[PDB]
Amino acid sequence: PRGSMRIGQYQLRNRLIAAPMAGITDRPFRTLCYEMGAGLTVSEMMDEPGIRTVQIAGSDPKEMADAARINVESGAQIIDINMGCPAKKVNRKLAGSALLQYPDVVKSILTEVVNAVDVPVTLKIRTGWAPEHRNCEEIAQLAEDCGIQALTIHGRTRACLFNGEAEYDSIRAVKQKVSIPVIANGDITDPLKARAVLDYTGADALMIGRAAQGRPWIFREIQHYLDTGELLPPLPLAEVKRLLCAHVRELHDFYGPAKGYRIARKHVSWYLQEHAPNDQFRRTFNAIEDASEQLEALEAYFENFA
Numbered sequence: 430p431r432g433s434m435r436i437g438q439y440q441l442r443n444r445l446i447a448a449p450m451a452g453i454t455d456r457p458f459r460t461l462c463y464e465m466g467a468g469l470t471v472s473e474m475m476d477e478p479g480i481r482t483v484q485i486a487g488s489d490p491k492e493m494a495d496a497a498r499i500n501v502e503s504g505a506q507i508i509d510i511n512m513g514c515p516a517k518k519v520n521r522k523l524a525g526s527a528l529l530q531y532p533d534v535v536k537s538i539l540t541e542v543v544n545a546v547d548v549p550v551t552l553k554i555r556t557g558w559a560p561e562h563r564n565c566e567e568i569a570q571l572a573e574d575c576g577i578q579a580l581t582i583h584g585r586t587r588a589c590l591f592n593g594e595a596e597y598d599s600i601r602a603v604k605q606k607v608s609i610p611v612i613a614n615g616d617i618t619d620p621l622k623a624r625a626v627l628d629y630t631g632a633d634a635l636m637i638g639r640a641a642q643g644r645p646w647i648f649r650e651i652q653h654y655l656d657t658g659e660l661l662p663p664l665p666l667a668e669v670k671r672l673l674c675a676h677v678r679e680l681h682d683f684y685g686p687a688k689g690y691r692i693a694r695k696h697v698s699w700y701l702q703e704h705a706p707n708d709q710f711r712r713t714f715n716a717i718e719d720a721s722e723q724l725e726a727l728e729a730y731f732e733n734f735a
């Protein structure tokens with residue numbers, strides 16, 4: 430790392446960011462990601478792990494600037510701007526990558542949010558609105574001019590949704606044009622892909638989303654390879670059990686055993702969706718309606734491999 434990764438005055442411990450994911454990234458999950466190797470975790474706008482990064486979404490420059498102010502007063506150290514989501518509505522208005530079609534609304538939101546807070550302001554985007562409309566370099570150059578201190582690019586256009594494959598050509602081109610740190614994002618699913626994307630794009634950091642849902646330990650696995658060129662062995666079934674059971678217990682404190690078992694069901698189904706999707710345990714665990722039974726059924730499944 431050439432002097433590590435830095436967002437303003439903040440130097441990150443590593444070049445691995447846990448992607449913001451509305452509904453998924455709760456305080457328990459983000460904390461688990463950070464404990465598992467994430468250099469930074471991003472949360473939703475209205476006592477967190479590492480540097481407190483809160484992402485704001487919306488379409489009105491003034492409303493955006495207020496959300497930035499309210500969340501900094503609430504403890505946010507870094508404010509991020511969502512200009513990436515492909516079907517995001519905020520206060521009934523089209524936000525996210527919808528904003529990428531209009532560089533004038535982009536210019537206005539970035540200017541207003543940057544001069545509202547005395548905190549580093551970052552931007553999360555997409556290639557453009559459609560494959561014919563990739564304005565990636567334009568939006569990156571403008572973000573830098575508005576005072577943005579880091580830029581994340583998911584390698585898909587708004588139209589792409591979650592289809593096909595992410596591309597790193599746009600990311601590579603932006604990094605060569607812009608002076609601010611660029612974060613590569615989209616389909617970074619293992620350490621080898623991560624190294625390949627970092628090498629091709631020349632990016633300052635990597636952002637991983639969906640691959641952390643059923644494998645939160647992927648952050649240390651990717652960091653280890655980037656650092657040493659050596660792979661960490663797969664986490665044995667006993668260590669997985671310890672981590673998943675310590676997490677479901679934490680999900681029974683936060684929100685209580687009433688709403689908790691419902692969340693622990695979500696977070697366990699992500700692990701199950703990745704390590705055993707067409708399984709007998711998946712259907713039976715989702716049927717459970719008691720918090721103590723969930724922990725009992727969880728250690729029952731992991732003991733069959735012992």
Ligand SMILES: Cc1cc2nc3c(=O)[nH]c(=O)nc-3n(C[C@H](O)[C@H](O)[C@H](O)COP(=O)(O)O)c2cc1C
Binds near residue numbers: 636639
């Ligand atoms: C369920 C879900 C929720 C998401 N929510 C947000 C969000 O609130 N803000 C945002 O910028 N991106 C959001 N994303 C985009 C992720 O950051 C996205 O997965 C990442 O940008 C690229 O894909 P990856 O998971 O392969 O890294 C979301 C994605 C998913 C699948």
